[PDB]
Design a protein around this ligand. Structure first.
Ligand SMILES: [Mg+2]
Ligand SMILES: [Mg+2]
Ligand SMILES: [Mg+2]
Ligand SMILES: [Mg+2]
Ligand SMILES: [Mg+2]
Ligand SMILES: [Mg+2]
Ligand SMILES: [Mg+2]
Ligand SMILES: [Mg+2]
Ligand SMILES: [Mg+2]
Ligand SMILES: [Mg+2]
Ligand SMILES: [Zn+2]
Lengths: 142, 78, 167, 86, 59, 85
RNA sequence: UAUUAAUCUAGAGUGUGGUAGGGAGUUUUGGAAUUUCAUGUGGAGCGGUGAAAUGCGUAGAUAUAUGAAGGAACACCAGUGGCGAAGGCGAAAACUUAGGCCAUUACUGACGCUUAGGCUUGAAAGUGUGGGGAGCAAAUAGGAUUAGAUACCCUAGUAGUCCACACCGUAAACGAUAGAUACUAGCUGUCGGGGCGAUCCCCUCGGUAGUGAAGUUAACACAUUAAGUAUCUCGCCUGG
């Protein structure tokens, strides 16, 4: 099991909340962070660990089943330098970014990953190209 | 007459009421105590001389000014 | 409500000033509970208000509604001696909720008791008190703190999904 | 004077232990409004009370807007009892 | 500013009376020219800070 | 490969072979510098002075000028940087 | 994402329980100090300045002692401080009243952030009416200084500074830094609530400061109270 001691808060926008958490942990060399858990945030973490930027992401629930928090860690090498270099969100609240498949972006000439949630949850840019279907663009991660 | 004692502690003494935990000030319950905090020249001594914390200093100041109005203490030397 | 008047009357003679206090009591106080009174005595006040260097001191610890003040405050100047009068409403004085709080009252008693033991040792009858420990710092921490230390509301969480947990 | 909050809450409660609903706050708010208009009319130079009075009026208006948006029928019930509209 | 002469010596009395007069002269010179509330508060804070820093190292 | 005896106030990045130890005690300090000197002496064929040695020959004394006090005080010589106007 | 039909409490509020405040308005009260007047003593200057001169004084000034009247502001306390959204708040009391911090096994169940237009407040000066006027002093008069002085100095001096009711709505109204939300080393202070129980000190939750790395900046510098990593909303900028 895993216990905590501190209150867990989150910003209302679920993509940039994670991005701020990730960037601060990367810059400060921190390892364990916490945030509130949402299915969109859970799903985006699902595609990241298959692509390999973070190691683990653990979501827990209360004894009443009314609140859940996901606690993820970053993948630092032995010399303590991260795998994430920079994250940037495109479709911020207010101005939502919609690009068709033909205009699907390529992040850092394919080195980075672009998060696109077309119709079956989040999916990396390359597999989105494979399926020839596009849609919502969440964030740039490299 | 002569000063009761020196600053056996650091450069400061100690807030009396805090140790006794008096928690309450009435002008006819520790009247003789308040004349101590007052300087000989009928003037409210500052922290460096009086030794109380800010709250008890503020509490004593209000009580002493209240006592000054009830005409129980002098107001100035001359 | 609970008020507290501190009357000042001329120093003519004690019984007749007591009668003046009784008159001042039964006339005003529109609605009132028991009006217990004390008699601090004759004192030579510092500044001679109205060139008066004496006075009988009375203290009233009544309690009642807010209307008990208006007539008395007016009757006072319309009255005789009554050099001064102060209605110190103790619900606004510098510290009243703590004084009513029971735990703080009991807490104050042990400190009174305990502080007195230290002062005794300092001023020993005749044997020299080498420590002269009073204002100075104490010994090791108050173990009771370490023992009775609070426990934060440590929310327990239950695992649901996993994958790649280096653990 | 400080309104006997207990009696007004006991009157406006829909069911016991419901000391934090929307109806009890607006019922309490109207009482605070009544007292503050009296106090401010007497004084006419206290502006902190004026700021508080305006804030309480706005909070009551916003609370009534929410309770009108959801379950409008109970909003009608509350308004006829409280007589706050006019 | 009552100071007893004690009639034992004279100098010592003036050694205490000098002190009484300096703190007296401070307020006497303070209450000679009219300053705005902002300048008066500024000068009040200035005197306390000057005295403080000196007291910090006096030990 | 500079080696150093960090004493709680050092940046670990600059040093390579960090040797967590004291630096304010004239006994701990003296023991460790000689220990590194011992590695040199041992390879230099000289008989060791403190390394690989028993208790009786390691005993050392505390220099002059209850327990020893390795406390940092003297805080009063750090007032606010001269300012004011 | 938007719409609709519903559930939940973690956001935000409410209640209970602890609790700190120069928060505000209305009505009374008090003492120093100045001025004027009244009564004594007294006998030649006082006053003012860089130096003086207008000025006051044998009609007895300055000074000293007592008393009376009146107006304005509230020494010390008073701060390596407190409160309020800002302007601001410091003699004492009563009444009315605003917000805030801590703990909540309680309650509603997203009711929240920003805000064009609108409303409220908003230093001092200024206005209108009626009072008040001790001290101070724009305008003004005189004496100085000066090449000249409509200025800096001095002696007088009205409006004004004060109160009530009506306006005016500007300030370097400054933290020269809009509000809200989440995260990001540490150290030293200080204040409040809570936990222990002599203080002192330890821990927790907040407010107010100093130092300080990553980080940011053109640099100065900011640095958990950001000018750092980011979002929402409003206002504003486009050479002199
Ligand atoms: Mg959502
Ligand atoms: Mg006189
Ligand atoms: Mg004005
Ligand atoms: Mg002229
Ligand atoms: Mg003049
Ligand atoms: Mg005019
Ligand atoms: Mg402007
Ligand atoms: Mg300002
Ligand atoms: Mg700095
Ligand atoms: Mg142009
Ligand atoms: Zn104290």
């Amino acid at each position: 099991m895993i216990t905590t001691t501190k209150p867990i808060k989150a910003h209302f926008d679920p993509v940039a909340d994670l991005l701020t958490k990730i960037n601060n942990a990367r810059k400060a060399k921190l390892m364990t962070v916490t945030t509130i858990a949402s299915k969109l945030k859970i799903a985006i973490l699902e595609i990241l660990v298959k692509e390999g930027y973070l190691a683990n992401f653990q979501v827990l629930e209360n004894k009443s089943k009314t609140k859940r928090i996901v606690t993820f860690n970053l993948k630092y090498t032995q010399r303590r330098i991260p795998s994430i270099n920079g994250v940037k969100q495109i479709s911020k609240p207010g101005l939502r970014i919609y690009r068709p498949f033909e205009k699907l972006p390529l992040v850092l000439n394919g080195l980075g990953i672009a998060i696109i949630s077309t119709s079956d949850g989040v999916m990396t840019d390359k597999v989105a190209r494979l399926k020839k279907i596009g849609g919502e663009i969440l964030a740039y991660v490299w | 007459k002569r000063m009761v004692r020196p600053l056996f502690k650091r450069s400061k003494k100690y807030c009396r009421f805090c140790a006794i935990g008096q928690l309450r000030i009435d002008l006819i319950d520790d009247l003789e105590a308040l004349k101590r905090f007052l300087s000989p020249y009928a003037k409210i001594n500052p922290r460096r001389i009086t030794g109380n914390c800010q709250m008890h200093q503020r509490h004593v100041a209000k009580a002493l000014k209240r006592a000054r109005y009830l005409a129980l203490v002098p107001f100035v030397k001359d | 409500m609970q008020y507290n008047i501190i009357l000042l009357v001329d120093g003519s003679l004690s019984l007749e000033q007591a009668n003046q206090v009784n008159e001042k009591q039964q006339q005003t106080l529109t609605n009132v509970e028991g009006l217990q009174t004390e008699y601090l005595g004759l004192k030579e006040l510092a500044y001679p208000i109205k060139k008066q260097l004496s006075a009988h001191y009375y203290r009233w610890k009544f309690s009642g509604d807010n209307q008990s003040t208006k007539d008395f405050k007016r009757t006072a100047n319309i009255n005789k001696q009554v050099l001064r009068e102060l209605i110190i409403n103790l619900e606004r004085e510098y510290g009243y909720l703590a004084s009513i709080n029971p735990k703080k009252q009991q807490l104050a008693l042990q400190k009174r008791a305990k502080y007195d033991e230290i002062i005794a040792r300092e001023n020993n009858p005749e044997n020299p008190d080498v420590p002269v420990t009073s204002g100075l710092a104490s010994t090791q921490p108050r173990l009771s703190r370490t023992e009775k230390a609070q426990k934060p509301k440590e929310e327990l969480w239950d695992v649901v999904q996993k994958m790649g947990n280096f653990d | 004077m400080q309104i006997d909050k207990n009696g007004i809450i006991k009157s406006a409660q829909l069911h016991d232990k419901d000391v934090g609903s929307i109806q009890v706050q607006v019922s309490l708010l109207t009482s605070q409004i009544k007292q503050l208009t009296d106090h401010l009319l007497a004084n006419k130079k206290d502006f902190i009370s004026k700021r508080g009075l305006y804030a309480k009026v706005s909070k009551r208006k916003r609370l009534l807007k929410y309770l009108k948006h959801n379950d409008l029928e109970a909003y009608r019930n509350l308004v006829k009892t409280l007589n706050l509209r006019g | 500013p009552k100071i007893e002469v004690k009639n034992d010596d004279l100098e010592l009395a003036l050694k205490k009376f000098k002190r009484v007069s300096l703190e007296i002269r401070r307020l006497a010179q303070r209450h000679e020219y009219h300053l705005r509330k902002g300048m008066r508060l500024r000068e009040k804070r200035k005197i306390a800070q000057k005295k403080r820093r000196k007291f910090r190292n006096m030990v | 490969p500079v080696v150093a005896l960090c004493n709680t106030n050092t940046n670990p990045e600059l040093v390579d072979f960090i040797i967590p130890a004291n630096n304010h005690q004239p006994q701990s300090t003296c023991l460790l510098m000689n220990l590194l000197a011992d590695a040199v002496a041992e390879a230099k064929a000289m008989p060791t002075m403190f390394a690989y040695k028993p208790d009786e020959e390691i005993q050392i004394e505390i220099p002059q000028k209850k327990q020893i006090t390795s406390q940092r005080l003297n805080i009063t010589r750090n007032p606010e940087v001269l300012t004011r106007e």
